[PDB]
RNA sequence: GAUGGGGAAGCUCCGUUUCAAAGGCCUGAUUUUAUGCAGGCCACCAUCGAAAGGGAAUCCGGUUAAGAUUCCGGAACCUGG
RNA sequence: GCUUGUGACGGCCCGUGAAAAUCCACAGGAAGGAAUAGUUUUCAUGCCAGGUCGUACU
């Protein structure tokens, strides 16, 4: 099948974002009039949350487990197609193509993104998504 | 030496309070080939660089002298 | 043999030469069977195998470098992978190659 | 071990609601006489509307697909001069020259006549018989999406943006010439909007991350502002020329006085969401900004040019009504040239008529 | 016919010591001693110069601002962009191989 | 070419990081012994040897009987705080 | 055109043609910072300081 979805993992290995895991929300086939090939709206993590012990404590655990989220579009070169998956309904409604473009509408979707990636992660589930790609 | 075009910024350096002095400078030149033209350069004594500006109509120049501060020592030629 | 059921689906039947335009095969899930070849470097090919097996596609393993498989194909340029997208009239993908 | 804003009237509550799109409202537009405002929208028409009433007396559609997601009507700006009856409309990778059968002989065919007189980065085509039904009198064919176009004040020139298009991101069309040129050499990040001075003969380039001011005349950079945004969205340039506001999606709007830094004089924090629109008021002491909030907030501003003062800016009043629809408020607006009256362009599908 | 001295006191031509022939405001031709060209910075891995970064004397980068001699991506600094596109490629593959094995 | 060492009746000779205890950094109510230092971390080596190798940064104009990239005038830059 | 600086190439070897100070970057994340005011002196501007010896002329 065609295996691009929008459940999809994925690590990003091209520009600023490089070796940076993502999830695919809205699969483009094939192009627009912007961005004339075929691309993906993902929704990625910048800062890695830090690791973190039975030593930790309170306030030391909220610092230590803070994410920033970040959303692009993306080329399908760029993305490397990972057997993983992630539940994307949290943010199916903020991500979109009149999402991007006229900021800072860019910021209300990644104030949703967080509260959906730091929630998934409290309680971890999909564990290999959290933690750092090393390379 | 340092060249600035806006004329903003040349009021904002003047009230900076590190400017000593200043100096005024004219200048003929023509224009394209057609005329001649009176040129002026207001230049202005920072610490560390000398900022000037050219102003090529001679009617915002005499404005621009009243413009200059008191205070502020200025030089003709 | 390889060389004969190859010589068939150059001449009737859907293919395509190269490693990007493979990819986009394997990515849109056009291709039915994908031939790799034995000079190609490893981490380009531990790559083709990861696109397969996530489209659950064929793969076989070319004894003979990138030169020789441009012969097989009967192409005077070197090509290091082969997909084809779809079938000849000889079977080719249901047998063991 | 500072004046309070019942000092400051007049500004403008919704009197009118431009009611009958189906779809986003992108972008608005005022007519020179400031009797006509145009509206583009997501439904592929472009609609012309009676300000005072509400009622609409012209619709061309442009897109008959228009579901398509690939391409829209982006903007549309009448003609600065006045009687010659010319909406300009960027649609996909496309401008449109149009002339609504609404004006009467002697307008429409003043602006017909200085179309035609004029009879490789773009390229300017008579009308096919379909686009002739459309009321377009030309086109001009770019290689990428036109999100932004401008008029010079005289009606002649005009600049667009294509975003992402490199060296030809930002184009300047002159109508009498039917001639495109690219004012630019070198490419200088993702382009979001292009504005001529009000009266010097300069360009002002907005980027994502900041305003070049260019001297046309002299060929060269004169001015580069350095907001402190990331994602700028529009820019607007004070009608006396030597202030200009900036808006930006991360929510801020910031005031820069050209000659006073480069740095911005004032930020202003009235947003709770994307701001997409900023715009001055041509001869009234006023300027707004709108948001992805659905909210349009109101402004005074004093600039005092010949003293050692900077500017006064005072806000005056926030507007609400537009209904926020999948993350988006107001996507555009633009006062009327005299009256303190705004007009606001919605995802919510409507235009609205915003007085004291 | 106007010829020209050494300013300094090393009169032979080594690697330091070059000279520009230049004319001045005062209507005269004089020496001028150049600087030693700045060579690019390498990409320690595939050895090629990389882009967006100042070619500057050593010394000289310790005046600039960061983002000479910088750039945004991970690994950016050091590395040739196409060799930390095969590491990530590389680093995923074999992590991945570690599972099945 | 000192030192640690080893030769030599001895003037001294070998050797240069070598069979040396060859210093300087972090933490501490180190929780009780009630006025005494406890727990750890780091790992090679003095010095001399280039006015042509390596190397932070200054230019124009003026001036003296005889001096100037060093004085005078203006215009720059570098290092450290 | 002459002198010279530099660029991308080509030839040559059983020859493949110094080292160290110094500077910068990258990976890592010890930890440190805000909502009533902090963090940034690798952005800008501003303040202070710069010793010893050689320097004529052939």
């Known amino acids: 099948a065609k295996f691009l979805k929008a459940g999809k993992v994925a690590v990003v290995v091209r520009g600023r974002y490089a070796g940076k895991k993502v999830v695919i929300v809205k699969p483009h086939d094939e192009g627009s009039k912007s961005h004339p090939f075929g691309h993906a709206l993902v929704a990625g993590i910048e800062r890695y949350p830090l690791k973190v012990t039975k030593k930790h404590g309170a306030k030391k655990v909220a610092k230590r487990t803070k994410i920033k989220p970040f959303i692009k579009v993306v080329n399908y070169n760029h993305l490397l197609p990972t057997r993983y998956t992630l539940d994307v309904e949290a943010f199916k409604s903020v991500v979109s193509t009149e999402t991007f473009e006229q900021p800072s509408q860019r910021e209300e979707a990644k104030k949703v993104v967080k509260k959906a990636f730091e929630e998934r992660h409290q309680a971890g589930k999909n564990q290999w998504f959290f933690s750092k790609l090393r390379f | 030496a340092r060249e600035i075009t806006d004329i903003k910024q040349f009021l904002e350096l003047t009230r900076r309070a590190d400017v000593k002095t200043a100096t005024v400078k004219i200048n003929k030149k023509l224009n394209k080939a057609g005329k001649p033209f009176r040129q002026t350069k207001f230049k202005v004594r920072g610490s560390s660089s000398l900022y000037t500006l050219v102003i090529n109509d001679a009617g915002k120049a005499k404005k621009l002298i009243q413009s200059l501060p008191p205070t502020l020592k200025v030089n003709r030629l | 043999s390889i060389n004969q059921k190859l010589a068939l689906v150059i001449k009737s039947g859907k293919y395509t030469l190269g490693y990007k335009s493979t990819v986009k095969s394997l990515r849109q899930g056009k291709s039915k069977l994908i031939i790799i070849a034995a000079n190609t470097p490893v981490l380009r090919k531990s790559e083709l195998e990861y696109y397969a097996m996530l489209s659950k596609t064929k793969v076989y393993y070319f004894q003979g470098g990138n030169n020789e498989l441009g012969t097989a194909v009967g192409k005077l340029f070197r090509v290091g992978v082969v997909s084809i997208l779809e079938a000849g009239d000889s079977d080719i993908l249901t047998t063991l190659a | 071990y500072l004046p309070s804003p019942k000092d400051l009237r007049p500004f403008p509550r919704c009197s009118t609601i431009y009611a009958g799109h189906k779809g986003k409202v992108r972008t608005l537009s005022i007519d020179p006489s400031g009797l006509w405002l145009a509206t583009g929208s997501d439904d592929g028409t472009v609609r012309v509307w009676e300000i005072l009433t509400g009622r609409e007396v012209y619709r061309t559609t442009l897109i008959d697909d228009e579901e398509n997601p690939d391409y829209h009507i982006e903007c549309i700006e009448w003609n600065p001069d006045a009687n010659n009856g010319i909406l300009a409309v960027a649609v996909g990778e496309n401008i449109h020259l149009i002339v609504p059968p609404i004006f009467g002989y002697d307008i429409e065919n003043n602006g017909k006549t200085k179309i035609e007189d004029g009879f490789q980065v773009a390229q300017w085509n008579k009308p096919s018989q379909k686009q002739l039904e459309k009321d377009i009198c030309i086109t001009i064919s770019c290689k990428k999406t036109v999100k932004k176009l401008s008029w010079h004040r005289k009606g002649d020139y005009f600049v667009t943006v294509q975003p992402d298009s490199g060296n030809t991101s930002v184009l300047i069309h002159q109508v009498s010439k039917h001639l495109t040129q690219s004012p630019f050499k070198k490419s200088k990040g993702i382009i979001m909007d292009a504005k001529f001075h009000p009266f010097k003969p300069q360009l002002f380039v907005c980027s994502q991350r900041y305003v070049r001011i260019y001297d046309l005349s002299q060929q060269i950079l004169v001015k580069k502002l350095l907001p402190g945004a990331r994602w700028l969205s529009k820019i607007?340039?004070?009608?006396?020329?030597?202030?200009?506001?900036?808006?930006?999606?991360?929510?801020?709007?910031?005031?820069?006085?050209?000659?006073?830094?480069?740095?911005?004089?004032?930020?202003?924090?009235?947003?709770?969401?994307?701001?997409?629109?900023?715009?001055?008021?041509?001869?009234?002491?006023?300027?707004?900004?709108?948001?992805?909030?659905?909210?349009?907030?109101?402004?005074?501003?004093?600039?005092?040019?010949?003293?050692?003062?900077?500017?006064?800016?005072?806000?005056?009043?926030?507007?609400?009504?537009?209904?926020?629809?999948?993350?988006?408020?107001?996507?555009?607006?633009?006062?009327?040239?005299?009256?303190?009256?705004?007009?606001?362009?919605?995802?919510?599908?409507?235009?609205r008529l915003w007085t004291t | 016919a106007q010829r020209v001295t050494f300013r300094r006191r090393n009169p032979y031509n080594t690697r330091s010591n070059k000279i520009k022939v230049v004319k001045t405001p005062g209507g005269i031709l004089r020496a001028q001693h150049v600087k030693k060209l700045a060579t690019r910075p390498k990409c320690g891995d595939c050895g090629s110069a990389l882009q967006g970064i100042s070619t500057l004397r050593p010394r000289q980068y310790a005046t600039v601002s960061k983002t000479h001699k910088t750039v945004s991506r991970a690994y950016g600094g050091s590395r040739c962009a196409n060799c930390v596109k095969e590491r990530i490629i590389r680093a995923f593959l074999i992590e991945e191989q570690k599972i099945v094995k």
Do not use: C, Q
């Not at chain 4, 900036?246 to 050209?258: I, Y």
């Not at chain 4, 600039?303 to 988006?328: A, E, F, Q, R």
């Open chain 4, 236 to 351: 607007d340039i004070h009608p006396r020329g030597d202030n200009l506001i900036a808006s930006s999606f991360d929510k801020r709007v910031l005031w820069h006085d050209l000659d006073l830094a480069s740095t911005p004089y004032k930020t202003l924090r009235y947003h709770e969401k994307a701001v997409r629109s900023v715009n001055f008021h041509k001869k009234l002491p006023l300027f707004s900004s709108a948001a992805d909030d659905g909210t349009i907030h109101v402004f005074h501003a004093t600039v005092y040019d010949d003293m050692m003062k900077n500017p006064m800016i005072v806000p005056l009043k926030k507007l609400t009504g537009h209904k926020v629809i999948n993350s988006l408020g107001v996507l555009d607006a633009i006062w009327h040239p005299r009256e303190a009256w705004l007009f606001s362009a919605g995802a919510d599908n409507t235009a």
